[PDB]
């Protein structure tokens, strides 16, 4: 994995020694070359995971998250170079350094062979994200949002540190490859109940769980666009990745410890979709949609069937691409009307027809239109939760109805109807904006052709 | 009730609006033209009976129970004209009513496609930006203290001056673009 | 479909409808003939004239505008303003 860590570190002298008009182009070009190179991780096998060294490995779960992570950096550089155009050159290089450094932390977060290295990288991903939100966020609430983002994650993760060091003292190792063969059953006791909570609540905060999601519609809203892209596309999926690793160790106690959290997520996907029906902020509507989509991934990890893991990793990749594109569409209107109020700019299909086509396709992937991998992940989670209990089909179907409702309500509100008369700075769509939309959508549609590379370790 | 010019509806205006609503809903009930014409003359007689009524309280009471009459005898799906609100073709062409300022954002290669149109548009934009400060100072010298009482706009008074706030009334889009 | 309206054609059709109204004789009627001052009509007659204009041209004149159209030239000017004639 060192052949990806070293070029990501070499993006730092590439962004600090570049000419002052070349610091976006060079980082975009070489991060696209790293994203091209990311496809060598598809050397996967049906029995063995691609095990590089004592420190790094990549199974078929970490590999799509890695390719999505290394693909997200040039798109964040494209999205964030217009509103940081008038920035100081040094602060612009600091923003690009925080993006590169967050990618550097993530690509060795997902490949961490040993779990405390995963914890160090996992909590290292707070610091560039916190700096991006609280420094290049736009409104006043970015400082409070950075507080909530920091102090939910550390409140969840500092019991996780004690849990992992306890496993290190008991099993003798936190290597995940050794713990695939030295895993012992975790019986019913109060000690093992709080063991389960300490191993799971950090990732429940990072997904986010319903009831603990209150960091998210302030951190995802008050960030800039690159912060919103990385938070929606990768940093929620760190939680699901950690769950799919750490639920190896939590059996059979998960089979009754999962019930309150399965209730919280099965009811939170209804409640947050209902919240999306009544949002005035478009960016907050996309934030609560992200909570609504990650609730299904939480249920799919907690029921731990193979169909549920396949649907959960497919839905994680699909939601990363879809939510990143929805935030970029929201930014493309915010850079014209300078307001996140959804009812302000109306009738935009009369003005921006191809951008409205991108709105249509992202709203169709948001409502899980087949054969998109959105529908593949959605559908496999619904199959596995039906096999779990036959009455969960009511909640899954009601969630799908409300999901279609807020997706097409977002589309109709922003794009349809009579246009707003007093708004006259609606520029045509720039080539940068349409290129950003297509670089989100076209991989998301091409992955419907060959979807087996995003279905996890147990496809 | 709700008007841009007046603050209320007079009694006479309420009677006329009732008479028009009653004839339209009657025409919905009485589809054929001769039969509608018969019953519309009967309704005209029912309005001409209490026409010369000088007691405003008695006329107000007759207006109120005539509204109860109309409410009990309205067509549930009355005939609406197509471009009238509620009609099957209402606000259909609003997706084709692109505003005038979107022509300013065209590329010059498609402004070169219509040279005389944009050359004739620049004198409209010039005329508007010389009319603007004069029509602002026209509005501020005629409006009383405390702001305007009604939404009525005053016309232009000098020669060479355009009426105040004329641009988004004149340069509104057509109904069939 | 939908042939364009001219001010000549609109004025001819409006005066054509008002000449088919028994409370207006056609030899007095002109475009400036005020319905209450000159032709001596009631406000009920004005509401019926507006409804005949609506049935003639196929669109509704609202009552805030229908209470004010008191000569045929005002009616022709309003139908011009709401149909955008002489493009």
């Amino acid at each position: 994995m060192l052949k990806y860590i070293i070029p990501t570190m070499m993006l730092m002298p590439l962004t600090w020694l570049s000419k002052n008009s070349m610091i976006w182009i060079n980082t975009t070009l070489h991060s696209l070359l790293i994203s091209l190179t990311s496809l060598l991780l598809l050397n996967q096998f049906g029995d063995n995971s691609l095990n590089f060294s004592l420190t790094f490995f990549s199974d078929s779960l970490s590999t799509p998250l890695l390719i999505l992570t290394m693909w997200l950096l040039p798109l964040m550089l494209m999205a964030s170079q217009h509103h940081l155009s008038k920035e100081n050159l040094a602060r612009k290089k600091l923003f690009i350094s925080m993006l590169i450094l967050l990618q550097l932390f993530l690509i060795m977060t997902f490949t961490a062979t040993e779990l405390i290295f995963f914890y160090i990288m996992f909590e290292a991903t707070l610091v560039p994200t916190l700096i991006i939100i609280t420094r290049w966020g736009n409104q006043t609430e970015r400082l409070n949002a950075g507080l909530y983002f920091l102090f939910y994650t550390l409140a969840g993760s500092l019991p996780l540190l004690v849990a992992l060091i306890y496993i290190q003292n008991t099993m003798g190792s936190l290597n995940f490859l050794i713990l695939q063969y030295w895993v012992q059953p975790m019986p019913n006791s109060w000690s093992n109940t709080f063991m389960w909570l300490a191993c799971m609540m950090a990732f429940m905060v990072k997904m986010p769980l319903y009831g603990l999601h209150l960091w998210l519609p302030k951190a995802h809203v008050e960030a800039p666009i690159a912060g919103s892209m990385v938070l929606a596309a990768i940093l929620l999926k760190l939680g699901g990745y950690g769950m799919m690793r750490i639920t190896l160790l939590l059996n059979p106690i998960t089979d009754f410890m999962a019930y309150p959290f399965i209730m919280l997520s099965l009811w939170g996907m209804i409640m947050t979709s209902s919240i999306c029906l009544r949002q005035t902020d478009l960016k907050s509507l996309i934030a609560y949609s992200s909570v609504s989509h990650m609730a299904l991934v939480i249920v799919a990890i907690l029921i731990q069937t193979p169909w549920s893991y396949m649907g959960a990793t497919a839905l994680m990749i699909a939601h990363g691409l879809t939510s990143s594109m929805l935030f970029c569409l929201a930014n493309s209107n915010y850079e014209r009307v300078h307001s996140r109020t959804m009812i302000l700019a109306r009738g935009l299909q009369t003005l921006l027809p191809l951008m409205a086509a991108w709105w249509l396709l992202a709203s169709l992937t948001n409502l899980a239109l087949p054969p998109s991998i959105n529908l593949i992940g959605e559908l496999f989670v619904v199959m596995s939760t039906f096999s779990w209990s036959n009455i969960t089909i009511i909640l899954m179907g009601l969630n799908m109805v409300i999901t279609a409702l807020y997706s097409l309500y977002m589309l109709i509100t922003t794009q349809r109807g009579k246009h707003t008369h007093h708004i006259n700075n609606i520029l045509p769509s720039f080539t940068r904006e349409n290129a950003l939309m297509s670089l989100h959508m076209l991989p998301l549609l091409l992955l419907s052709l060959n979807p087996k590379i995003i279905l996890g370790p147990l496809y | 009730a709700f008007l841009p010019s007046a603050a209320y509806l007079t009694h006479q205006q309420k009677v006329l609006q009732l008479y028009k609503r009653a004839l339209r809903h009657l025409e919905s009930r009485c589809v054929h033209r001769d039969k509608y014409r018969y019953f519309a003359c009967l309704l005209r007689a029912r309005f001409d009976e209490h026409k010369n009524e000088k007691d405003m309280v008695k006329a107000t009471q007759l207006l109120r129970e005539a509204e109860k009459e109309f409410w009990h005898g309205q067509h549930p799906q009355p005939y609406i004209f197509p471009e009238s609100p509620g009609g099957t073709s209402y606000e259909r062409y609003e997706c084709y009513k692109v505003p005038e300022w979107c022509l300013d954002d065209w590329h010059p290669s498609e402004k070169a496609m219509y040279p005389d149109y944009f050359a004739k548009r620049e004198q409209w934009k010039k005329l508007r930006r010389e009319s603007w400060e004069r029509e602002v100072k026209q509005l501020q010298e005629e409006t009383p203290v405390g702001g305007p009482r009604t939404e009525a706009l005053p016309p232009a008074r000098k020669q060479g001056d355009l009426p105040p706030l004329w641009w988004h009334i004149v340069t509104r889009p057509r109904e069939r673009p | 479909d939908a042939p364009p309206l001219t001010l000549e054609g609109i004025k001819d059709r409006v005066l054509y409808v008002l000449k088919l109204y028994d409370k207006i004789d056609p030899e007095k009627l002109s475009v400036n003939s005020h319905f209450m001052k000159d032709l001596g009509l009631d406000s009920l007659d004005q509401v019926e004239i507006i409804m005949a204009m609506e049935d003639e041209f196929g669109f509704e004149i609202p009552d805030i505008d229908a209470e004010k159209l008191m000569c045929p030239q005002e009616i022709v000017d309003y139908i011009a303003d709401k149909k955008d004639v002489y493009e």
Partner: peptide, 13 residues
Amino acid sequence: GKRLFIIKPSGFY
């Protein structure tokens, strides 16, 4: 004849 100009947003980009 009497062709009317059709105001439409900028389709060049």
